[PDB]
Design a protein around this ligand. Structure first.
Ligand code: HEM
Ligand code: HEM
Lengths: 735, 734
């Protein structure tokens, strides 16, 4: 293939054949080397929360609203108002989110980097970002690009007559393309870009509910669905099935989906004035003269009446700069006929309809009503039809649903409400925020923590292995992409996590009963002090790690940060939490991978979501094995004669050349370590164990911890990594 | 299919990536390697302190004993791993290319992809595994980089060849160095060379046409093909490849013959079974192999069944002891072309003595054998004269080999101030880019304050010239081989003083002015003396400080005294030719080639300076604000306050009222036109405009263009300036 190869082969700056070219199936650590603090121009010590709280937020909003109608000659505003274009920018920034893996969304501002800056569906959003740049120049570090793109759409809706619930800032900027996201395996974009995600099916009605997991778009390079219909076939009934699937994969139900589409398509228009052959390279492929912009259009000045974005030429309402109910009115009251846009694409026009839809530049010109196939979807499915019919007669119910769904869209990947900043954060708490009760009571102090650690360690049924394993099981549900999971809330005690087979539900039950005894004893006796179950789960694992280090000859402070609260079941939605359930866990030697995701690839992926470096992933696995911390208490990977003592025995014995390693099963998941001289079977290992002795960069770390004399360094590094992981969700304190 | 896995992972980076869609776009990956977070020792680990505390003699004693402690999983030929360990060290050091300074043993990269899995490194996985117990014993106080070389050094000495000594000091690295251009072919040897010979298969005519800056005849080889060019068993053509490849590694004829005749005193090659019996290389092998590869399924895969290169040659009758048997055999035997057991072309003395030993059976003997690359040395007129001389005067070979082996192992270690341990050779060699002892006593802060005031009021000097000259001197530094930088004032010597990129007539007038400041100081300050090298850096540094003051920011710009001035005798014009830049984005110099755009050359140079993307970006914008172009032009100088340290370069770059269009056919010149007045306002280069085009670089430009960030700009510039000026300061250190 020519695909993925430049016709000129550079000899500079990484040019040449590379290791991943020769050995493309080998595990890559790239996803654990992103987002490092050197790469950040602002430095590691910059506190975005402090900066945003000092922002003159009201003046930022007034500057945005003034920009909306200050038309720039290099991209003139339709109807004299950029509001629709700015709503699209915000919706596309937020619109990449996938609920199952928690990736995409607006929370990293990734629309400004490859590949999102150059996806076909983001065509001419380079102009939109450029138009808002002067607001970022004025306000500097005190508002992120990530926050600004979404605030701009929020302010746009409010200045076009639609009052929102409010807004929360808090998204710090990122500084490189996030190459950890599986957007798909296709080698083409829309109109192609979907053979792999449909497994070669082309029957568009039958396949619609069979989109490859965890994807949430129907072609590579789209936000959700194809506006001409599935595979460009202008069938509204099949389009509706694609919409249900895609919006479902983004965490939206039918009410939310109709409210978002009918709410957004009140505003603006689509652009399809000239054929695609007039349009130049996307931003990542454009020449230096374009200075970060792309899709240069060679007809006229390439803008104004010649704008070309999607290829469609649809104006939904008679007032595209003002909130209305004209979208549903047109959709339901007109009869529709299939026509072509000027650029050749399929759309729908009203039969015998009024010629009163305004032109964006010529006051003398009007058009008939028009719709996309994906808008006709909403009256060609029974459930969408019933919602649209109700909202035709009750526009106030659409406005309520749209306010709620728009707020959810923009904030779904922001994390707990302790992350949300600014003066207009909505007061209602929503289930998709994974709510927590407010912390109350006088917080436990150092002496209470010392008393609780001793009580925990002296309780029947609690040992170092079980305490450590339970804490980590609770902690590794965290993922940095959408800031969901972690130990705050004590959700391991609730459905679904209490019944996850990867948590060993019978053992977990007995551990949690013992912790609840510690809790009853303490609460029953220490005046104004109560301790949460969440702090006891974390404190028990922390106490176990401290004890295991002492038992290994090292006196170390293992620091504990108190103040977690306990969630209720009503704040813990089963569907949302089911997305956090692991299929394999390398920290606790659970499960295994599949053909397209090997055991060790799942481990690296999870480490990236925990923000771990390669040294931190390595040290954690080796210490969990030394602690005997497997999910089922097995000996797999437990390469030590001192289980429960925090030593680097795992690494020492893994690298010992007197042990030969051979496959025991057929499927490559189980390994036996045999003493070469005696021929006795000494050890059993998994792929998560043996990858550390196979991958050249991971093995180099294994060797550090296997070196004579490094027992103390091993202990210090394990404790640092343990503390980092236990605290990932502590946004009430600071990250 | 090439460079694609048959199974497409959906985790850990699986899926189509940005580089796949837009493979021609500039990539910043080489500025993101070797980050301190990635180093398991921590960014505060000091390798030099660890190594100086090492019990060095005990390490060498334990290496020496390991040589004859055969391990059953890879039994030692003749009972001695010495030859194997000499090969390990020579392959570690043997990837070096003098022109670009990449490869060599100084980063210990043989333990990572791709070098761990190149065909020429077959079975060195075993060699590395055999020495791992010594690394495990001594811990952090010896690096893998130092150990692999020290092991070969000790192996020579324990097989009867006393070396010049050794220097340690190579700190380990912790990821594959994906900045090196090894070539553009999509196959390894026996293929791997269509591109580097532009599809020529005329083995004599093409030999001196090898693609620059490569130093091997096929992808995956160290230097040349042991069976002849493209496997053609023609010794005279092989000799032309050896001279080309070794020259590209910085070795001349005498050094070349010494290295090959010296090395092949020892050990043997391995070709006992055909290649179909050999499994995947390390990076392709299954988890059971635990980082090893090339599993051989015949017998136990080892001992008599060893298979490495496919050849089965034993050069001397005493493969564990230094001798003159290589030359004695080469010159005196009549050679016939034969096939090894694995099917490769080699040469045998079919009517010679049957007294060459077997590595495992003391009762079994063989005839004399050679490679085609060995017969090369008697099939070229200059190599033959050397070979004949040394046959008769073997002490001259021993002298040449000790010096060339020292050069091989230490060519990328950098200045002598970096060399560690108790047996560093006392001779100063030209390829070490030597520096003297200082003159008189070290300037103090009072002397620095007087010299800054003098420099900023001297005829022929100003802010722009001073900043340009210091950066010109600094950017010769390259971290791959630790060559270049400002220590030595080598801008003032040949060849740098006559480089077109240094504007020789301006430079001369700047250097004469700094020498006048120097003459005033030296001898009127008792025994205090200042070097020209310190005055070049101090003058640029004082200019940056004043330019910040004039932009409204009061900042103390640090200065570290103590550089010395190199002599011209210690500055070889060919050695320094390798540092001459094709383009220099910091000073808006030069143009790209048919294989690398100007902006790619700049990112490459930034990687050699260890810069991050924000450091690269801030330096370019500040150099433009200072008016520090090599030729004093206004290209990229997007400010009305030239000489004042403002972020005007970034503000004006991103101003939408300016439209940028190509002016030259070559893609190298651009004009910025004011869209309202229709007037040409600015001229820019590709090094200027990339900061407004690449999305990750433009994100950094925006920071510096934002209101309020004028002081941050100055702070970040000053930090980056100090880092670059000090890269070669291993005397402090660096
Ligand atoms: C099934 C889901 C959807 C599809 C297929 C779709 C499709 C499109 C297409 C093809 C365009 C025209 C781009 C152009 O040529 O300029 C567009 C424009 C727009 N869409 Fe959507 N859309 C969907 C959902 C949404 C949502 C959820 C919102 C926001 C809540 C949104 C708001 C907008 C706005 C405001 C515009 C007008 C942009 C302008 O005036 O420049 N759409 N849509
Ligand atoms: C024209 C340059 C050279 C070529 C083409 C070449 C080729 C080879 C080949 C094909 C092998 C056999 C590998 C195997 O089958 O085990 C080998 C082995 C060896 N080479 Fe070279 N060589 C070159 C230069 C050097 C140099 C410069 C040195 C060191 C100063 C060196 C030292 C050795 C040693 C000691 C062995 C034996 C390894 C053992 O005993 O396992 N060679 N050479």
């Amino acid at each position: 293939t020519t695909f993925g190869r430049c016709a000129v082969k550079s000899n500079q700056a990484g040019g040449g054949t590379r290791s991943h070219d020769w050995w493309p199936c080998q595990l890559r650590l790239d996803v654990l080397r992103q987002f490092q603090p050197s790469q950040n121009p602002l430095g590691g010590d910059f506190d975005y929360a402090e900066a945003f709280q000092s922002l003159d937020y009201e003046a930022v909003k007034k500057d945005i609203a003034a920009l909306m109608t200050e038309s720039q000659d290099w991209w003139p505003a339709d109807f004299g108002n950029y509001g629709g274009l700015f709503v699209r920018m915000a919706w596309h920034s937020a619109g990449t989110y996938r609920a199952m893996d928690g990736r995409g969304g607006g929370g990293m501002g990734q629309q400004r980097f490859a590949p999102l800056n150059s996806w076909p569906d983001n065509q001419n959003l380079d102009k939109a970002r450029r138009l808002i740049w002067p607001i970022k120049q004025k306000y500097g570090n005190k508002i992120s690009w990530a926050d600004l793109m979404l605030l701009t759409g929020n302010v746009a809706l409010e200045n076009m007559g639609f009052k929102t619930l409010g807004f929360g800032g808090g998204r710090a900027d990122t500084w490189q393309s996030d190459e950890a996201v599986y957007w798909g395996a296709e080698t083409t974009f829309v109109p192609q870009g979907n053979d792999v995600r449909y497994n070669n099916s082309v029957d568009i009605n039958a396949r619609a509910d069979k989109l490859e997991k965890p994807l949430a778009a129907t072609h590579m390079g789209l936000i959700y669905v194809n506006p001409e219909g599935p595979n460009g076939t202008p069938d509204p009934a099949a389009s509706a099935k694609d919409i249900r699937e895609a919006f479902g994969r983004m965490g939206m139900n039918d009410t939310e989906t109709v409210a978002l589409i009918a709410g957004g398509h009140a505003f603006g228009k689509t652009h399809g004035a000239v054929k695609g052959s007039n349009i130049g390279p996307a931003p990542e492929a454009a020449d230096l003269g374009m200075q970060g912009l792309g899709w240069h259009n060679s007809v006229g000045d390439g803008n104004g009446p010649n704008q070309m974005t999607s290829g469609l030429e649809v104006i939904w309402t008679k007032t595209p700069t003002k909130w209305s109910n004209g979208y549903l009115e047109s959709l339901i009251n007109n009869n529709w006929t299939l026509v072509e846009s000027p650029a050749g694409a399929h759309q729908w026009e009203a039969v015998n309809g009024t010629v009163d839809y305004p032109d964006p530049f010529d006051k003398t010109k009007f058009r008939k009503a028009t719709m996309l196939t994906s808008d006709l979807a909403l009256i060609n499915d029974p459930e969408y039809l019933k919602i649209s019919q109700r909202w035709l007669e009750h526009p106030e119910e659409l406005a309520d649903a749209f306010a709620k769904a728009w707020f959810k869209l923009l904030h779904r990947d922001l994390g707990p409400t302790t992350r949300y900043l600014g003066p207009e954060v909505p007061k209602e708490s929503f289930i998709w925020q994974d709510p927590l009760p407010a912390r109350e009571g006088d917080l436990i102090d150092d002496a209470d923590v010392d008393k609780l650690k001793a009580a925990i360690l002296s309780t029947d049924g609690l040992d170092v292995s079980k305490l450590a394993s339970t804490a980590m099981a609770c902690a590794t549900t965290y993922r940095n992409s959408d800031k969901r999971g972690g130990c705050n809330g004590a959700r391991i005690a609730l459905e679904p996590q209490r019944n996850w087979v990867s948590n060993n539900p019978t053992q977990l039950s007995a551990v949690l009963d013992a912790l609840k005894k510690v809790q009853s004893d303490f609460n029953g006796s220490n005046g104004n002090k109560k301790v949460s179950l969440a702090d006891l789960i974390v404190l028990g694992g922390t106490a176990a790690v401290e004890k295991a280090a002492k038992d290994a000859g090292v006196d170390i402070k293992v620091p504990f940060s108190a103040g977690r609260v306990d969630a209720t079941q009503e704040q813990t939605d089963v569907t949302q939490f089911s997305y956090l359930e692991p299929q394999a866990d390398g920290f606790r030697n659970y499960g295994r991978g599949t053909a397209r995701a090997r055991t060790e690839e799942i481990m690296v992926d999870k480490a990236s979501q925990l923000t771990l470096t390669p040294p931190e992933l390595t040290v954690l696995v080796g210490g969990m094995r030394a602690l005997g911390a497997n999910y089922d208490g097995s000996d797999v990977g437990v390469f030590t004669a001192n289980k429960g003592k925090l030593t680097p025995d795992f690494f020492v014995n893994l690298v010992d050349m007197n042990i030969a390693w051979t496959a025991s099963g057929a499927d490559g998941e189980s390994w036996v370590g045999t003493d070469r001289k005696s021929r006795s079977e000494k050890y059993k290992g998994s792929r998560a164990d043996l990858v550390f002795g196979s991958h050249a960069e991971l093995r180099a770390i294994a060797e550090v911890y296997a070196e004579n004399g490094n027992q103390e360094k091993f202990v210090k590094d394990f404790v640092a990594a343990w503390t980092k992981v236990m605290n990932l969700d502590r946004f009430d304190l600071k990250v």
